[PDB]
Design a protein around this ligand. Structure first.
Ligand code: NA
Ligand code: NA
Lengths: 512, 512
């Protein structure tokens, strides 16, 4: 009966065993580096294994670093909140306004009406729309908004079962992948890009090459190539390739295709005419995008010139918060008195939901762990021990680092992997006498390449929650898309990334 | 029809008018102090008038200070999270564990069985129990936990209607007041005390007089006197004073009294025997309290001696987080496989609720506004302009400051009032050449004295939400209890506060 008892309480016993077996490392080394390494190993073990919720393991550093004497609790608490959180609040307000008034339904239905009911073109339409939507919103929020809509659309198309099951698997997987693919494009698209940008700006304040325009101009071609290749791979793997009737215009449509078009048109008509709340939300979203462009792109710094007395004070989070708080003020619904006043188009009770407080805590914990790693001296020791590896040719170092980051991001969340690997790859970066961007950009791009397992990133879990998918087919599709993404990233780094960032030579802003 | 339109959209028009009319202040003064004053006035206006949710107004500083050029957005974002938030997370985990397993029901019912059904003694029992519970938990959480239980108890007593209505009004008000009264006792009892402690430690790192033991030893007598006086005042105002049958032991109980005792005993028996989850929660709560005592009290620094190499690194938030994360790990419910593993006695989905994210954002915004006030130079200018007030005798200055804080905390929340007044009262404190504690302690004690209106503090709103109360009776009771509290605070400051803090003379740690 002991075996049953130890098997049932696996998580608690594993937590205790992990805490105890690694305890000799700080018990006998008498160094701050050993204690920080113990904290890092415990946190990474609980993130990869998922013995505890990710937010609890994120709160562990604020519990472990002060007691080890590495850094005061005030400093850790300050590190638990950063600029990324303000931008997250603004974007979450925008996404709540979009979801609440069914703007995404209108966009998706107009998209489906424009594209058609041809399954290959239809899946391409969902991938493009989800990528464009995730270009500004977070990948998790974008997937959560788009998955129910596309699921209902494909169910309606099928109704008007092996083929339908394959089609719904394909649409689920393409939504899950396209969310991340679109998130790659911009700094604000996903949390991983934000973490990388914050870390790069803090560690190298001198460097200023990472702007929104530069990030878009070196990420959009690669992301577009990966999107097209992933669409082709998915439609070949699941639906099968029938180009003869695909590219040729089917003017004489079959009865079932025209029935599907008619039922989609009926659904759109049932959705109703565009309302004023949706117009206000769309206008505010467009203003957000235009002002994110408007900060210094290198052509005309329209927004940054007005504030050319205090540079760096106002950032993308400032405009994000501006529009998000505007969403808290514009009247939407008036009101036999019926409470007199209006409704602010977003109530704080609605923003309390739709808001990833767990993700905020997780990112704060990762930032606190990274800061403790820098302060305790662990990063310097890792760089010193990894210095002899610098004699090896650089391109293989980038290849290996990207491969390890990709492999370890299937089991750990993207913020977890990026927060674990930035303080390891950076000291390696200036230990070799190589440009830090040359190693960091491929790693932060490949961190998002998490497609094998539903627990890899939240979008995959959200998509898998519908039950149409199976783990093995998801593994096949993830392997294909991951190979495509890694190949495209390597091709970009070799060919067109280096002309603009001058990655071949060592930069001035990097330490000597 | 214009009048109806302008009256319906009062909040939006008022927000726009407040933003625009105060705009000339930063438009033409060409100083950072004026810009920070504009930010402060806008935030205070929206906090007092409730034109926007308190959290939105708390997010406003992170929008205004960076664009005004006062301080970078990174610094503001760092200021939105502090040691207060870690301690809040730990205490909220503890409170969630207590609520989920109905430990508070057992405690309250055992209390009712012990005290009896005599209405005066019964209301005293609820006041004492709520004060003791709020001595560790937050006032809002304590009120939210105790209000339904006591409401059900008094309804059951009445069932076994003017007299009942008066009794339920009395018990509602006694719970609402006793929550705050108990919160006064300890640093961790309420948010205001924690904010004051953080501000005092940051502004005066040299001073170390504010420990948990010192705070208890100068707050418990005053809080106890105020509690007894408030109980007497409430029972005289609502129930009426009948001492002849009150203090004398009614051994020959009335039929309705014994029926009420029997029905309470039946309710307790229906509650069931004490479970293992409740025992674990109680043990962890007791450990929290004992370790809060165990940090340096001045007698034996048992917890601080072990860490006597890195002083101040591990604080009460460390033990709070320790116990809170322990609540995330101990198994409670096992599991025809039924999901194999156990339940961690608190799921993160439950901690996402029960957690005041709005309060966390509000406190962060107040801290950011205070930091901007210190950095922009507004506090120095206020101190310079308030220096001529120092010729007036000190005791009257403390009296006026306490009266202003008490008056303004009836309309504004306690964290808002304390965050607005600490950066005003401190520079006034060292501008006069008087001990800063001499002014700050009465003000931070009287900030909690918010009893007049339901919007004064969250416990009042929670209590008023049941609908038994009316605004005018609440105003009368609040005036009585507020006069009692102010008188007791003044008596303490005059008589027994000064021997231990040496408030009569100027301290060394205060600036010259
Ligand atoms: Na991942
Ligand atoms: Na108040």
């Amino acid at each position: 009966k002991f075996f049953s008892y130890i098997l049932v309480y696996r998580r608690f016993l594993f937590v205790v065993f992990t805490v105890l077996v690694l305890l000799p490392l700080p018990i006998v080394l008498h160094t701050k580096e050993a204690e920080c390494a113990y904290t890092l190993f415990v946190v990474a073990t609980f993130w990869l294994t998922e013995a505890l919720p990710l937010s609890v393991t994120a709160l562990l550093p604020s519990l472990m670093l002060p007691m080890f004497g590495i850094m005061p609790s005030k400093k850790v608490a300050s590190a638990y909140f950063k600029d990324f959180h303000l931008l997250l609040i603004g974007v979450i307000c925008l996404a709540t306004s979009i979801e609440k008034w069914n703007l995404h339904k209108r966009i998706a239905l107009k998209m489906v009406m424009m594209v058609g009911v041809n399954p290959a073109w239809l899946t391409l339409g969902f991938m493009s729309s989800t990528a464009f939507l995730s270009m500004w919103l977070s990948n998790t929020s974008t997937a959560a908004m788009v998955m129910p809509i596309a699921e209902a659309v494909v169910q309606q198309i099928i109704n008007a079962t092996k083929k339908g099951h394959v089609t719904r698997k394909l649409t689920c997987l393409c939504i899950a992948y396209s969310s991340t693919i679109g998130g790659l494009t911009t700094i604000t698209g996903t949390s991983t890009n934000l973490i990388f940008a914050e870390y790069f700006n803090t560690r190298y304040p001198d460097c200023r090459c990472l702007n929104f325009g530069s990030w878009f101009t070196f990420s959009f071609p690669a992301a577009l190539i990966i999107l097209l290749l992933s669409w082709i791979w998915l439609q070949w793997l699941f639906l099968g390739f029938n180009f003869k009737e695909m590219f040729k215009c089917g003017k004489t449509k079959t009865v079932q295709q025209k029935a599907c078009a008619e039922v989609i048109k009926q659904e759109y008509q049932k959705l109703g005419p565009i309302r004023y709340q949706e117009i206000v939300t769309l206008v505010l979203f467009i203003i957000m995008a235009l002002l994110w462009f408007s900060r210094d792109p290198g052509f005309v710094p329209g927004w940054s010139a007005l504030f050319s007395e205090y540079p760096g004070f106002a950032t993308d989070s400032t405009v994000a918060l501006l529009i998000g708080l505007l969403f808290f003020l514009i009247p939407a619904k008036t009101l036999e008195i019926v409470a007199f006043d209006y409704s602010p188009l977003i109530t704080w009770k609605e923003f309390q939901s739709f808001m990833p407080w767990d993700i905020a805590i997780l990112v704060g914990g990762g930032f606190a762990l990274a800061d403790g790693c820098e302060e305790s001296g662990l990063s310097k020791w890792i760089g010193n021990k990894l210095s002899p590896l610098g004699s090896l040719p650089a391109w293989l170092i980038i290849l290996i680092s990207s491969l390890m980051v990709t492999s370890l991001t299937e089991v750990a969340s993207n913020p977890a992997t990026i927060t674990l690997f930035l303080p390891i790859l950076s000291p390696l970066a200036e230990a070799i006498h190589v440009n830090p961007l040359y190693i960091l950009i491929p790693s932060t791009l490949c961190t998002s390449f998490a497609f094998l397992l539903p627990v890899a990133n939240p979008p995959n879990a959200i998509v898998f929650s519908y039950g149409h998918l199976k783990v093995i087919d998801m593994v096949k599709a993830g392997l294909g898309v991951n190979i495509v993404g890694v190949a495209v990233v390597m091709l970009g780094i070799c060919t067109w990334i280096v002309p603009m960032f001058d990655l071949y030579t060592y930069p001035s802003w990097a330490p000597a």
